[PDB]
Amino acid sequence: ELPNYLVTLPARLNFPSVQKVCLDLSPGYSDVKFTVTLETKDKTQKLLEYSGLKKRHLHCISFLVPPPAGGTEEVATIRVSGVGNNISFEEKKKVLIQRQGNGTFVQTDKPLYTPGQQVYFRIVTMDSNFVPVNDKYSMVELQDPNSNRIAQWLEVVPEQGIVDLSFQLAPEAMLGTYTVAVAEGKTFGTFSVEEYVLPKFKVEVVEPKELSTVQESFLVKICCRYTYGKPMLGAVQVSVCQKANTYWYREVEREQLPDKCRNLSGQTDKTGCFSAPVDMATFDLIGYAYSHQINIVATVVEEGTGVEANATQNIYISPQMGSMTFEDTSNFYHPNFPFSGKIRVRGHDDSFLKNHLVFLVIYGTNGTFNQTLVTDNNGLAPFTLETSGWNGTDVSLEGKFQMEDLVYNPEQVPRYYQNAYLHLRPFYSTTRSFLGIHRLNGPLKCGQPQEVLVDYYIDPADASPDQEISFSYYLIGKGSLVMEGQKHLNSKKKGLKASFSLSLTFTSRLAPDPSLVIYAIFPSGGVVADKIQFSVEMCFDNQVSLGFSPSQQLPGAEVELQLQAAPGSLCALRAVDESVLLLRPDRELSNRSVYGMFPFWYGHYPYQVAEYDQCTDLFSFFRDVGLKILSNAKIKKPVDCSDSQVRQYFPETWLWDLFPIGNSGKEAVHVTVPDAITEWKAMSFCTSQSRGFGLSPTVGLTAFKPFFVDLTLPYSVVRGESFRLTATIFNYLKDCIRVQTDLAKSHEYQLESWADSQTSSCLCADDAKTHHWNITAVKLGHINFTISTKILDSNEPCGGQKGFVPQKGRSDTLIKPVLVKPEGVLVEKTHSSLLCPKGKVASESVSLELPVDIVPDSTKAYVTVLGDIMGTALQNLDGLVQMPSGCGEQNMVLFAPIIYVLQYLEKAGLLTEEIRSRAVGFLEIGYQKELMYKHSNGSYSAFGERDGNGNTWLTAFVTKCFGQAQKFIFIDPKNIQDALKWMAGNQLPSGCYANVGNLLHTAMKGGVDDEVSLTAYVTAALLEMGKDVDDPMVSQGLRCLKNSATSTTNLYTQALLAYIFSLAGEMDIRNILLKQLDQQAIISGESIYWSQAVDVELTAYALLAQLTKPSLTQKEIAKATSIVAWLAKQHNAYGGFSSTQDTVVALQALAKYATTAYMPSEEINLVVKSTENFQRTFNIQSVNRLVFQQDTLPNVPGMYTLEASGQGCVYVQTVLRYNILPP
Amino acid sequence: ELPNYLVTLPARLNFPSVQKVCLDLSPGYSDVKFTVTLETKDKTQKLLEYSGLKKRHLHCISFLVPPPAGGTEEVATIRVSGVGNNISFEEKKKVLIQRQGNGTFVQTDKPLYTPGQQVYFRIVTMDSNFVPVNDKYSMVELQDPNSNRIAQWLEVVPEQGIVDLSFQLAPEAMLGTYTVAVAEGKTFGTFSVEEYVLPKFKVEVVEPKELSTVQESFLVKICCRYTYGKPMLGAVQVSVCQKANTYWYREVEREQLPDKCRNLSGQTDKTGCFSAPVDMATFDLIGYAYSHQINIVATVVEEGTGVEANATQNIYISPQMGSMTFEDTSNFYHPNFPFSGKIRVRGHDDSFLKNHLVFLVIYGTNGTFNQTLVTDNNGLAPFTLETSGWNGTDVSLEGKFQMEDLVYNPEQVPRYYQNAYLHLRPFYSTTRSFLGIHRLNGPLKCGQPQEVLVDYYIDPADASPDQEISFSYYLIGKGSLVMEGQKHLNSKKKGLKASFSLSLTFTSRLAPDPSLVIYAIFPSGGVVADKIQFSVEMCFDNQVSLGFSPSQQLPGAEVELQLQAAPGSLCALRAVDESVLLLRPDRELSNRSVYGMFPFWYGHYPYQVAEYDQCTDLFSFFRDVGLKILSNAKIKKPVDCSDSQVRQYFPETWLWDLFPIGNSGKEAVHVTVPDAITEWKAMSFCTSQSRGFGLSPTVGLTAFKPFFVDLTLPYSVVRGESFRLTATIFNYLKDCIRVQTDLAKSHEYQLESWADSQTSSCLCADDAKTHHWNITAVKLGHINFTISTKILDSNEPCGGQKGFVPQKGRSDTLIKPVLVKP
């Protein structure tokens, strides 16, 4: 016999992890010292030293990995060496050690906020094995919808992997999509802040969920239900419609047909759900001018109330009436042994079909085979096939509904049958023996031992009867070898179709789709092996479950709450209203999102250590699961080339408390239900360094009362108007009752009161009596509307019999707040100052006034201080230096911004030398990327060296890029002088732009793309490095441009021709067009910009025209400060790699503005002082520099003093909002 | 009638841990809202918002401890407030918050080094819940014994709570007790460095371990064994001696009588244990001038070699021949209900005596009572007493051997009976009921769920049959609440001596001495309770074991070491030689040492939050464990005054590695044994954040060969000076064989030709033959000395028969380095 060995490691090692390495020894050897090492550049760690035994032995050891010798990634070398008695086996492979993606998320308690609320949020960072990581954050930031950073917490440490942070939102905070970022990661937790009111009912479709083209009619069923679980009445309008399909060509036959649609009007039943049938004779399933799509817009208005809900459902019409997919089968067959599998058969309605005659056709080189099968009464079709006629050839399985396909017809869409296709490859079995694993149905549970049966046959032609046989099994989860073992079997049985069993246990360390690989090496050297995948549900380490008792309980009294988790955990709990999830769907915190933030659905070898043998077997079996194998056994295929209750409450988020789980595993807390009659959806994620991360499914506590009231009233209420206060009184008791309703009159709202002063009415079971009022308000802010109802004892009978009072819940009151705003139209007066003392005190007196037409308590004024030139995304400027390229003409516009960002960063005080070196290395390898576009004439071209003389734009761009890169690296100026002779030859002094050269990409050279702009750029490119006017090229350029300077027109071109005269330093003709430039600029507050993508370019060129010119004054300083404040919020000003030239010109405008006037703050103490001797102090040093701080001032608006002391420049913006009478 | 509440907190909160808090409520309430909250000097978190229920309910929640506003230690306050329906209950009590003690130990691979070797050491931090912390180490330092810091490490980060560091000692490093110190703290580890040679055998006493005065003559059974488990023949000289005791007055009568020594010479038997009786009347037991403490110094010399091993056994001589101690009993007793207890019965050797009539006498105000009791065949005396006639008065119990004590005599030392004395206090019981907890044996077993039987009697005069009575139980360990429960019983059973059971689980969170408190509040206002103290062995939550397979190996063959700990744990190793432990005894790394690393007085409040009266009940039951109680029930009494291989090897440690544990909880490694004929003692500890710290027993591997050699030679050799190299040959084969010996000649050393060749000889079973040579050194430094022995087949009989050649063990080649100095 020949002894063998097999060592297996993960191919992709992870740095804070503990991994396994397995080594299997044949019998024989038994005198050879085996040792395995992994060699990094820092050490040589031996994994195991070992010797052979008299039997086959599989030995697996765990190890802490070496750190990577690079920054975060290093190719280490795995080495097996067997020494001893004049033989030295040595084999050598490469593995990869990298710091894996520590995935994080941020969970706000709500996706929605009124202004004045409190944004609570938890940031969780967690490992690939769902272990929490206490890698403490540098910074976390909360930014406006204007991308302006308004909150920042620095150097924050998490407890048990999670951190909670509370930001009190402003009562005057602007409406939009706020964002929260951590450490400048890939996670941007966004929440909306807007004005909203809570809907009390959800409308949804029920029966239209699938539609096929073979149906005749479908029954639209629209169910509207309250949040507390009761049905309701109300008028229903359902718009069922198919829109016209927009074709892939958008220029011809664009005059479309109108959308085909039918509108349903109705009333819901006693179960509160309206049903009506709609034919598909209305819609055009045959026609390609209409999409295969039906929009259902269901709109329900409550009876006598006026509130409205809508459901927007999208249905995709499918001509496919049945789906047949392989789901439990292998991609490989062993030769001349039976092959097993099963087919999932489903219909159009994704339901498990019954008693279907499926037909399996087999394509092979011997002959086409056909076999029919019948599904069972569960929806599966098992099959076993005899492969002995397949002759070791790759075959094809096709499961079909019928033998004959549908003939394509003009009058009807051909209904396609989704067949079951499979390709079977012969396994590389050099020795005749068989393994097979019986697969385990659908999704498998976790924490319980799965019993898996393994079938085998060891033939007595390659294994002698004295040789003990053993099967080595590996369970691989998420690309790491997570379970190992070997089973020894008795050698006396030898040749029979036998079986044995394994007892596995799937968990969160196991994948959603993990693998089982079993193998057996014979003493002949051949191996027989089989692997299967698995369907494992998205489980977790902590078995968390949430429990309410008694789970449907009256509003205002206690409910016991159970947390089930692993002991020693710290667990976070969110109990929130249903109604706040009715407007915006919540940010999905589930098992699928936690499993989805780690991108490892592929497994496999990485790019760094991949083995390209090609110019299936056991090596492919370990390659597909992501394990490096080193062996001398025949595992490689040879390569081939081819009782009154007062009710004020907490209707928003209810529970946001942290609970550490004790040693019992379970923990209870009694919580008091808020008085809003809704459903509370609660969820919890528990985390622990012991077991891991666990996530409860969300549960619901239905707070419900039998008899109650409900006020409805809008949120956006202005003063003076009479709004519709609608009070819907609900009786859900089974007996008819009498109610008495009264609004408690106070001195804070006015009405003339239809049916007030303790009105009385009669109602009965499932009844909603809607009283109406219109109310006008006199106060401001939040004011309370209070109502009370009682069930009177019936002196007279009504509704038939005498009314009956319940013993409990006889009375019900309600207090509801509303926000009332001042009258008139709003208008803002803003004033900005750039206070820059240089080691001193700089002061400014600000005066802001108001016309005398104001209603009282309407004027508000607040001041904002900012220490930085722009809001956020300095790390975007850090990331602009990456991603080199050499394809297309986007390479020059991606290699342009490096010199600009390293000019910008050194004047901001945050320059780093390692990105300096990396960026100039990228620029030095980027100098070679413009060399194969060099023309044969001695110039550059857009594409090819034979196209012709190049365009002036690209030659001027590479002239600027070569002349502005001499401050960082060595660029020779000989190519500039080689280009200048072709600038002189291309444009005549008698006439400029003789039209030689063309760009490959259109709408790219500018916003206008005319000849005078390209001429002014190529004649402005010479003197923009620091040169004066000394050349014939710039002389003929100014000769061409001085005629157009007096011609005016097209202010973009006027600004960029004022740019070259500002480079010339002359004030004679650019001042006669400067006055018509700034007066045509529109005003957007203090963030103004010039208006004629094109406007941002015009703003950048006019900022450099106003900045490059000499004699900068303070009004020009404030004007340019307003311009760069508008450019601060432009996300297209920086962040584009294949974008236009706007990015580099706005970025060099930022660089020149940091050069000349505004340098960033490093120590500013600011004080504001008012008329009424009120003062306030801001501190802006280095980390609250970007924090855009606010302060609300209580004085009557007048003259105020704004003083800045220290070293640095600061920006102060004062905003006065007030309301004026419309006449 | 009158509703009652009870709030329980630990009285000493540790900052990185979580703590329980408990609230128990009577039937009644259901309209008030109880808030318990813990305020400190920066924040106030609401521990429980909680409305009342119509039954009795026990609700307990776990909370994170607030940070210390004082920096490391502060006095917070917990308060209870029941507000609602114009009812305002408000009470408060002070509690202490301090940072928990970070324990730290350092181990080394050996406790003893020659200069020129590598010193390894591991330093481990530890919490009071035995979980390791990866706290940032500032600096660690290594000091010469002249108080000079010779090595220095700055800014070392722990990997899974431990640090593993190495240092190369100098080849001319001077001799003394070097010290490893951490951050100028209280932790230090001393290792001695001097020249040594490894002893191959040890010697200890077997039979003399206790001396009582009633003996006539006592056996001295000295016994000497090799490290590889085999007996040895030799010459034994034992000095058994009684020293003259120095007087307490150190000013007069300096003339001292000579020490009563007896010298015994002997040869060990085939089992290698020398036994000889010594008449103990030679030693002066009566007089005070001679000490009551014998000292046995035994020196054993191997024949033909000259090496010697000494053992010093210091045995106290005691006149005590027995001990009555109370160990399973309560300090309290309930009035007019039976009281149970158990007595340990031990003799002069502290062994369990059989069939001893122990006598219980009871000292009370009604009358002194006597009772006799027969022990079982285990060593226990279980008794029960009626307390109906005791009338609620504190009593005393005394358990004795006999009624009459021994008369003091001038001619004899008065031998004392160590009786069992106890004082029983009356329980403060306002309402008549009984609650007793049955005891559980001696030291309990960790991890297994024990079953405890608790019996009770609820008197129907002070209870109502319609309402149920629920017993609340607290299983408390190491000053914090561990396990909780509320177990109800219906009062339809009425008044009887009923019983029920609890399923307890004891872990490392629970103490070596944890407590169990069971109580109940009746609606009259009274309370009934019982507290017992358990006894658990010094346990760890991480159960770790080591196994060598096949646990006895010839040198040169691999051995599978199996290491069994929790998954996700990082484990140390130490496979030291036994011969290293024979020179310097190891500093103790055991469960006693780890549990004694932390102060374990406990059972009381801190002095900053202590409560005292002007001058037992449930409040004393919670004081004696150290828990704060806020209650309005009758919980306080009214105030009153109170074949051929060459053997070069590893005479240092064999295994010193870090093996993390995978998910199966098992690890294994085939480790190659070193080529010394010895025993390797291996021990490991594992640190995990999940299951904490775990420490394994010291398992042993006997690396043994049947036929081998050994070289006796000193460490230091003066160059140009002759020494005696003594090579001994051991035959442990069962037959008689013929050996042949060749000492390798080289230019590194010179020989004087003493039995140069033809040293072939006959060695029978369990035999040793020593050959001496006169060898001098010629060159400086380390010198190899090589000996090769083999078995030759010859027709010349050895012992009357031809020497049978082995199949394994035919030859043995040994290489020993030696140090040569000028």
Coordinates of N, CA and C in Angstrom, one line a residue, chain A residues 230-294:
Chain A
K230 N -60.7 45.8 15.2 CA -62.1 45.8 14.8 C -62.3 46.3 13.4
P231 N -63.2 45.7 12.7 CA -63.5 46.2 11.3 C -64.3 47.5 11.4
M232 N -64.5 48.1 10.2 CA -65.2 49.4 10.1 C -65.9 49.5 8.7
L233 N -66.8 50.5 8.7 CA -67.5 50.9 7.5 C -66.6 51.9 6.8
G234 N -67.2 52.6 5.7 CA -66.5 53.6 5.0 C -66.5 53.4 3.5
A235 N -66.6 54.5 2.8 CA -66.7 54.4 1.3 C -65.4 54.1 0.7
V236 N -65.4 53.1 -0.2 CA -64.2 52.5 -0.8 C -64.2 52.9 -2.3
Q237 N -63.2 53.5 -2.8 CA -62.9 53.7 -4.2 C -61.6 53.0 -4.6
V238 N -61.8 52.0 -5.5 CA -60.6 51.2 -5.9 C -60.4 51.5 -7.4
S239 N -59.1 51.9 -7.7 CA -58.7 52.2 -9.0 C -57.9 51.0 -9.5
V240 N -58.4 50.2 -10.4 CA -57.7 49.0 -10.9 C -57.2 49.3 -12.3
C241 N -55.9 49.4 -12.5 CA -55.4 49.8 -13.8 C -54.0 49.4 -14.3
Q242 N -54.0 49.3 -15.6 CA -52.8 48.9 -16.4 C -52.4 50.2 -17.2
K243 N -51.1 50.6 -17.0 CA -50.6 51.7 -17.7 C -50.0 51.3 -19.0
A244 N -49.8 52.3 -19.9 CA -49.2 52.0 -21.2 C -47.7 51.8 -21.0
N245 N -47.2 50.7 -21.6 CA -45.8 50.4 -21.5 C -44.9 51.4 -22.3
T246 N -43.9 51.9 -21.6 CA -42.9 52.7 -22.3 C -41.9 51.8 -23.0
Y247 N -41.8 52.0 -24.3 CA -40.9 51.1 -25.1 C -39.5 51.5 -24.9
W248 N -38.6 50.6 -25.3 CA -37.2 50.8 -25.1 C -36.6 51.9 -26.0
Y249 N -37.2 52.2 -27.1 CA -36.9 53.3 -27.9 C -37.8 54.5 -27.4
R250 N -37.2 55.7 -27.2 CA -37.8 56.8 -26.6 C -37.9 58.0 -27.6
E251 N -37.7 57.8 -28.9 CA -37.7 58.9 -29.8 C -38.8 58.8 -30.9
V252 N -39.2 57.6 -31.2 CA -40.2 57.4 -32.3 C -41.4 56.7 -31.7
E253 N -42.6 57.0 -32.2 CA -43.9 56.6 -31.8 C -44.2 56.8 -30.3
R254 N -43.7 58.0 -29.8 CA -43.8 58.2 -28.4 C -45.2 58.6 -27.9
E255 N -46.1 59.0 -28.9 CA -47.5 59.3 -28.6 C -48.2 58.1 -28.1
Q256 N -48.5 57.9 -26.8 CA -48.9 56.7 -26.2 C -50.4 56.7 -26.1
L257 N -50.9 55.5 -25.8 CA -52.3 55.2 -25.5 C -52.6 55.6 -24.0
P258 N -53.8 56.0 -23.7 CA -54.1 56.2 -22.3 C -54.2 54.8 -21.5
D259 N -54.0 54.9 -20.2 CA -54.0 53.7 -19.3 C -55.5 53.2 -19.2
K260 N -55.6 51.9 -19.3 CA -56.9 51.2 -19.3 C -57.2 51.0 -17.8
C261 N -58.3 51.6 -17.4 CA -58.8 51.4 -16.0 C -60.2 51.6 -15.6
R262 N -60.5 50.9 -14.5 CA -61.9 50.7 -14.0 C -61.9 51.0 -12.5
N263 N -62.9 51.8 -12.1 CA -63.0 52.3 -10.8 C -64.2 51.7 -10.1
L264 N -64.0 51.3 -8.8 CA -64.9 50.6 -8.0 C -65.4 51.5 -6.9
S265 N -66.7 51.6 -6.7 CA -67.2 52.3 -5.6 C -68.1 51.4 -4.8
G266 N -67.9 51.5 -3.4 CA -68.7 50.5 -2.6 C -68.6 50.9 -1.2
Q267 N -69.2 50.0 -0.4 CA -69.3 50.1 1.1 C -68.9 48.7 1.6
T268 N -68.2 48.7 2.7 CA -67.7 47.5 3.3 C -68.9 46.8 4.1
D269 N -68.7 45.5 4.4 CA -69.7 44.7 5.1 C -69.6 44.9 6.6
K270 N -70.3 44.0 7.3 CA -70.1 43.9 8.8 C -68.8 43.4 9.2
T271 N -68.1 42.6 8.4 CA -66.7 42.2 8.6 C -65.8 43.3 8.0
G272 N -66.3 44.4 7.5 CA -65.5 45.5 7.1 C -64.5 45.3 6.0
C273 N -65.0 44.6 4.9 CA -64.1 44.3 3.8 C -64.9 44.1 2.5
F274 N -64.6 45.0 1.6 CA -65.5 45.1 0.4 C -65.0 44.2 -0.8
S275 N -65.9 43.6 -1.4 CA -65.6 42.6 -2.5 C -66.4 42.9 -3.8
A276 N -65.7 42.9 -4.9 CA -66.3 43.1 -6.2 C -65.5 42.5 -7.3
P277 N -66.0 41.8 -8.3 CA -65.2 41.2 -9.4 C -64.9 42.2 -10.6
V278 N -63.7 42.0 -11.1 CA -63.3 42.8 -12.3 C -62.8 41.8 -13.3
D279 N -63.3 42.0 -14.5 CA -62.9 41.2 -15.7 C -61.6 41.7 -16.2
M280 N -60.8 40.8 -16.9 CA -59.7 41.2 -17.7 C -60.0 41.4 -19.1
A281 N -61.3 41.5 -19.5 CA -61.7 42.0 -20.8 C -61.4 43.5 -20.9
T282 N -61.3 44.2 -19.8 CA -60.9 45.6 -19.9 C -59.4 45.8 -20.2
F283 N -58.6 45.0 -19.6 CA -57.1 45.2 -19.8 C -56.6 44.4 -21.0
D284 N -55.5 44.8 -21.5 CA -54.8 44.2 -22.6 C -53.6 43.4 -22.2
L285 N -53.8 42.1 -21.9 CA -52.7 41.3 -21.6 C -51.9 40.9 -22.9
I286 N -52.7 40.9 -24.1 CA -52.1 40.5 -25.3 C -51.1 41.6 -25.8
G287 N -51.6 42.9 -25.7 CA -50.8 44.0 -26.3 C -49.5 44.3 -25.6
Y288 N -48.5 44.5 -26.4 CA -47.2 44.9 -25.9 C -47.1 46.4 -25.6
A289 N -48.0 47.2 -26.0 CA -48.0 48.6 -25.7 C -48.4 48.9 -24.3
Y290 N -49.0 47.9 -23.6 CA -49.3 48.0 -22.1 C -48.5 47.0 -21.4
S291 N -48.0 47.4 -20.2 CA -47.2 46.6 -19.4 C -47.9 45.5 -18.7
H292 N -47.2 44.4 -18.4 CA -47.8 43.3 -17.7 C -47.8 43.6 -16.2
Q293 N -48.6 44.5 -15.8 CA -48.6 45.1 -14.5 C -50.0 45.8 -14.2
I294 N -50.5 45.6 -13.0 CA -51.8 46.2 -12.6 C -51.5 46.9 -11.3

